Each structure stands twice: as structure tokens, then as C-alpha cells.
């Protein structure tokens, strides 16, 4: 028979059995005449310290081959997998993420053990590029929080613009923590362009919105272009109407992402164990301080593994980190209500029949460009 454990951490108990079912079905999928999977798991902790032990004691404990990581979808639990990815990074156990989106985790060679099915906030910056492909946004301003997220959101936008004859008219940057932004927005307003881009936290986003409403920038020819988070929770609740805040399709759909990860892990673990020279993972977390020579090799198989007919579309990863290239859904605000105007498929913006209001209750698409 042979057993190969797959560790997991999730939201509720109601996901445990929604992980446990997935290991069932994708064993009814996978031939099973050679190897046979089993389903190890435990719920999540809010206090990041416990989580790590709960990986060590509950999970890394049982010779685990991978750790599926997901949580309460609040913006305070996007640093729960931190402890989980050090604790699984020490050993080179592949850490599948199901839901977390801050970009430190993808980032060019920092979490050497961290997979994920969900492309980060910083890939929004290629959809913004495609917002500016269509509609013809020639003169942008970009403000971003001065943090890991914001820099990896701005640079990744700048590198797509660099091959264009363009960049930001002015790039702008504030404090990730500041409750006063009045200052910077002044010179921001006093400029030639009229279509302003933001990659900021729900709270840091809030400040600048109502701070830029206080300081008269909401309507006329102006056009506010942002992403998700900049329209989730406390951003939006002080935003303008006329904004185009993006939203990731099935971006908070846990039991749809778990479904993929066990299938991809099944279509990787059978892609692993078919190989001559394959090694057992290391046993417990205490007094064990060495990797398993199929740690990277499982992960380097994990990164290069396809999977048509997923749920959140087709699961495929890239070079830099390893993140999917899933459809977004371009939202628009009209009377304190987010209502879809278009759909960026994997690659480009295809808009629906719905008509799109602009800032100050504008029927006509403005231009940037002074007015």
C-alpha cells in the first residue's frame, strides 16, 4: 500500500473534513496500486507563535510531505504563515499557500519553501498595465505605501512601463502607519496628469481617500485607479465613487483552493515517487536540524506541475516565486456599491455590456491630462 502524508492548516473544522474529502477523491483519482495518500491536519492559531509549534508538534511531527496553509480571511492573519514558512523552510518542506497575498512571500528568493495557488497583490500591477492598454491612460501618478508590498507593487509596474516610452509623471510614497497624508497629496494635486494609482493597505488607503476628498480631488476629470484591498474593509468605506478597484476571482474561496492543492500535490507526489533515488522526509521538529534531499526536488517538481480543469481555473506557477495566472474581475463603484464592469482573463481585459460611471458622477470617460 505505502503511505505518504500531506500536512494541512485551514480556517474552521469545517475545512478539515473539506481537506480530508479531497485526499479521498484524488485517491479515487490516482491509480493507488503503487502508493496511497493519507490526510494529516490541524486548525490555525491567531497568535503566530503557537502556529509554528502546531506545525512542529502536530504536523512536521508526522514525516509530512507538504503543509497546506490557509486561515481566517481577515488582513491581520496574512502573517500567520510567516512562522509556518520558517518552520517548513528550515527543512525545505513545500509550503502551499491557499489564500495569502502579501508579496514578501512570492518575493525573489526569500521564502525558499513557499508555494501558492493565489497570485499576489504585486501582479495586479500587470492588470493596471492592461487598464492603461485599453482606455488610453497616458499620464499617471503613482502613490504607494513605503513597505515590502508597495515597492514590489510599484517596481513590477515600472518594469512593464520601462519598455514603453513612459513611466509615472511623478511616483509618490508615504508612511505605512501615517494617519496624516494632507501634506503629500498637495503636490500630488498640483500636477499635470489626472488619473492617480494606489497600492496601499485598507487603513493607509482609507486615510488618503477621505484626505483627498477633504482636499478636493474626487470628481471632475480625475480618475482613481486601484486594486483589491484598496477596496476591502476600511478602504472603500472612505473611498470615492468612480474608482476601479480590482478583485481576485475566488480569492477568498478556501474550499475551492484546497481542492486544487491536493490534486496538484497528488499530480506531484506521483511525479516524485516514480523517480529512482527518492528520500524519506525528516521525522520530528525537536533536535532535528537537517533537510531531506528530496525537499527542493519535490518543490522543483511542485513549481513545474500543470493541472487542467482545477476550480479556480487552471493551476500553473511561474519562475520568480510560484504563483498562478488566474482571471481577475474589474470592479466599479456606483452609489456605495461595487458592481463589475469587465473581466481581465489570464492575459487581457474583455468588457461586458454594463456601462461605467466615472468620478464626480461622470457619464463620459475622462482623459487624465489636466482638463
Amino acid at each position, epitope marked *: 500500500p505505502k503511505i505518504v502524508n500531506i500536512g494541512a492548516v485551514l480556517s474552521t473544522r469545517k475545512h478539515e473534513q473539506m481537506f480530508r474529502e479531497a485526499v479521498n477523491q484524488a485517491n479515487k483519482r490516482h491509480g493507488s496500486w503503487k502508493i496511497q495518500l493519507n490526510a494529516t491536519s490541524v486548525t490555525h492559531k491567531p497568535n503566530a507563535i503557537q502556529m509554528a509549534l502546531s506545525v512542529c508538534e502536530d504536523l512536521i511531527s508526522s514525516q509530512v510531505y507538504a503543509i497546506l496553509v490557509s486561515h481566517p480571511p481577515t488582513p491581520n492573519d496574512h502573517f500567520t504563515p510567516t512562522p509556518v514558512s520558517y518552520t517548513a523552510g528550515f527543512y525545505r518542506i513545500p509550503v502551499l499557500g491557499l489564500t495569502t497575498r502579501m508579496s514578501i512571500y512570492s518575493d525573489k528568493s526569500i521564502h525558499l519553501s513557499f508555494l501558492r495557488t493565489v497570485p499576489p497583490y504585486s501582479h495586479q500591477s500587470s492588470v493596471w498595465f492592461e487598464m492603461m492598454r485599453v482606455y488610453s491612460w497616458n499620464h499617471i501618478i503613482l502613490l504607494v505605501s513605503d513597505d515590502h508590498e508597495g515597492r514590489a507593487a510599484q517596481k513590477r509596474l515600472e518594469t512593464l512601463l520601462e519598455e514603453r516610452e513612459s513611466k509615472a509623471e511623478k511616483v509618490l510614497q508615504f508612511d505605512p502607519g501615517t494617519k496624516n497624508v494632507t501634506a503629500l497629496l498637495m503636490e500630488a494635486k498640483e500636477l499635470e496628469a489626472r488619473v492617480i494609482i494606489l497600492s496601499a493597505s485598507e487603513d493607509d488607503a482609507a486615510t488618503v481617500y477621505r484626505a483627498a476628498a477633504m482636499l478636493n480631488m474626487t470628481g471632475s476629470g480625475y480618475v482613481w485607479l486601484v486594486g483589491e484591498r484598496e477596496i476591502s*474593509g*476600511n478602504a*472603500l*468605506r472612505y473611498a*470615492p*465613487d468612480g474608482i476601479l478597484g480590482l478583485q481576485l476571482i475566488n480569492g477568498k474561496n478556501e474550499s475551492a483552493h484546497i481542492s486544487d492543492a491536493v490534486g496538484v500535490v497528488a499530480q506531484a507526489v506521483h511525479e516524485l515517487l516514480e523517480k529512482e533515488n527518492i528520500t524519506d522526509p525528516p521525522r520530528g521538529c525537536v533536535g532535528n536540524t537537517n533537510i531531506w534531499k528530496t525537499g527542493p526536488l519535490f518543490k522543483r517538481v511542485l513549481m513545474s506541475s500543470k493541472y487542467a480543469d482545477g476550480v479556480t481555473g487552471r493551476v500553473e506557477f511561474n519562475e520568480d516565486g510560484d504563483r498562478k495566472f488566474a482571471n481577475y474581475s474589474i470592479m466599479n463603484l*456606483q*452609489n*456605495r*456599491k*461595487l*458592481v463589475q464592469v469587465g473581466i481581465y482573463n489570464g492575459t487581457h481585459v474583455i468588457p461586458n455590456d454594463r*456601462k461605467i*460611471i466615472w468620478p*464626480g*458622477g461622470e*457619464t463620459e470617460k475622462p482623459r487624465g491630462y489636466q482638463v
Partner: antibody, heavy 120, light 111 residues
Framework: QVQLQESGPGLVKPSGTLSLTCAVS?????????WSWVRQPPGKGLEWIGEIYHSGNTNYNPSLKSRVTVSVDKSKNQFSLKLTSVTAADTAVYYCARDVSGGVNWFDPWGQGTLVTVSS | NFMLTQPHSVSESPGKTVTISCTRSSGSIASNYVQWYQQRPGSAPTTVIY?????PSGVPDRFSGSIDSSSNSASLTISGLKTEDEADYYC?????????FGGGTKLTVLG
């Protein structure tokens, strides 16, 4: 100095059309607000229906997204609500109201209010 | 969408101070602007309180409002209650999907 007056409070058949309408006084329609509708079954609270901008862009309530239409007329300075397929529960008073808009939903001034009696 | 829940009926003596709870189910209350309506019987509704706690010209200081962040409830309060505070009452919030109203409060003036 803005006012709003709505159509005759009549009978409507089971599985039928609602046909209501609302002139605008002391003001315009192309003004930056949203023109909209609400309803109250007698001896009960309120309940929203949908809205229409001066352009004709529209926004319906999810519980009725399939049964409602709001339309406009930029000459009379009037608009109108239609609400099809009606039943027993749809027996109510109906108010059109100006949704003061630059952010929120906030209804001022309201309509007078007209009872569409849904019966045979 | 989220269902606002009010006290079915409230009551309080004249010249006093009475409180009106507007409990929002899902999503934080202070997030979205809350308003308040006095629907006079056999009359169509009229704002008493706009923008959580912003008051029109003519509606008196006895009409005030506050938003309990911690209980998830807007509170319409009237002090110095009069015989003309006997009326129906309705809070109104919204979200990304709809325009919600409360279940309502019947306020009879005790004594």
C-alpha cells in the same frame, strides 16, 4: 426647494405588472443625484428596490434583480418604476425619493406615496 | 446583504432621554454611513439624522446619533422627550450589494 410626486395608487392582478411613475419639481434630473424607489407592505417596515442615474445607468436589489426596471425622461423631468410578476406579498405603499449622492445612500426629499393594491 | 435589527417597541417618559439600537449582523457598523428616519403615521418618511450623526436645519439638538463600534450598533438618542416624539423610527445603512433598512421601532411616550 426640490419636490417629487408619483403616479396613481391602483389595482394590479396576480402575476402582473407594477406601473409607477414620478415627476420631479423645483429642480432637475441631470443634477448629480440618483433617482430611486422604496416600498412598505402595510403594518411593516421599509424595503429598497433600485436606482437610475441621469444617464440611464441602473442598479437593482439582489432579492429582486430579475423583476425590476427603472427608466427616465429628460424632457418632462420625470422618471418611472416597473415591477413585474407580482403576488400577495407585493401589496404595499410605493415611494420614489431623491438619493442625495456624493458618497452615501440618503433619501431626501421622499415621494408622497401610493398604494399598489395587488388583487383580483 | 446584512439585516439591521431594532427594538420592536421602545418607550420613555416626557422630558427624559431614550435610546434606539440599530444592530447590524455582518460587516462593521461604522464602516458604512447610518441614517435615521421618523415615519409619521399616515405620512411619508423624513430624515432626522444624516451621516451617522449629521443633523438637518429645523430638526432640533434633542435629535442626535452615535455609532457603537464595539456593539456593532448605531444609536438614535432623543433627550427632553416631548409628546411629538411619539412616532415610528428607522435606521438605514447600506453595503456593496444593497440599501438596507431596520425592522423599525415603535416609540410610545410613557405617561
Amino acid at each position: 426647494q426640490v419636490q417629487l410626486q408619483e403616479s396613481g395608487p391602483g389595482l394590479v392582478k396576480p402575476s402582473g405588472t407594477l406601473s409607477l411613475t414620478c415627476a420631479v419639481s423645483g429642480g432637475s434630473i441631470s443634477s448629480s443625484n440618483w433617482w430611486s424607489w422604496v416600498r412598505q407592505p402595510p403594518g411593516k417596515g421599509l424595503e429598497w428596490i433600485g436606482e437610475i442615474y441621469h444617464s440611464g445607468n441602473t442598479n437593482y436589489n439582489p432579492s429582486l434583480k430579475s423583476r425590476v426596471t427603472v427608466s427616465v425622461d429628460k424632457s418632462k423631468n420625470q422618471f418611472s418604476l416597473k415591477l413585474t410578476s407580482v403576488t400577495a406579498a407585493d401589496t404595499a405603499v410605493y415611494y420614489c425619493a431623491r438619493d442625495v449622492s456624493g458618497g452615501v445612500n440618503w433619501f431626501d426629499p421622499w415621494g408622497q406615496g401610493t398604494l399598489v393594491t395587488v388583487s383580483s | 446583504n446584512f439585516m439591521l435589527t431594532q427594538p420592536h417597541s421602545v418607550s420613555e417618559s416626557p422630558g427624559k432621554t431614550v435610546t434606539i439600537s440599530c444592530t447590524r449582523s455582518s460587516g462593521s457598523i461604522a464602516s458604512n454611513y447610518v441614517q435615521w428616519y421618523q415615519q409619521r403615521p399616515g405620512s411619508a418618511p423624513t430624515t432626522v439624522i444624516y451621516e451617522d450623526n449629521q443633523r438637518p436645519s429645523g430638526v432640533p439638538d434633542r435629535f442626535s446619533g452615535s455609532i457603537d463600534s464595539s456593539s456593532n450598533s448605531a444609536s438614535l438618542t432623543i433627550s427632553g422627550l416631548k409628546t411629538e416624539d411619539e412616532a415610528d423610527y428607522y435606521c438605514q445603512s447600506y453595503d456593496s450589494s444593497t440599501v438596507v433598512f431596520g425592522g423599525g421601532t415603535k416609540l410610545t411616550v410613557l405617561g
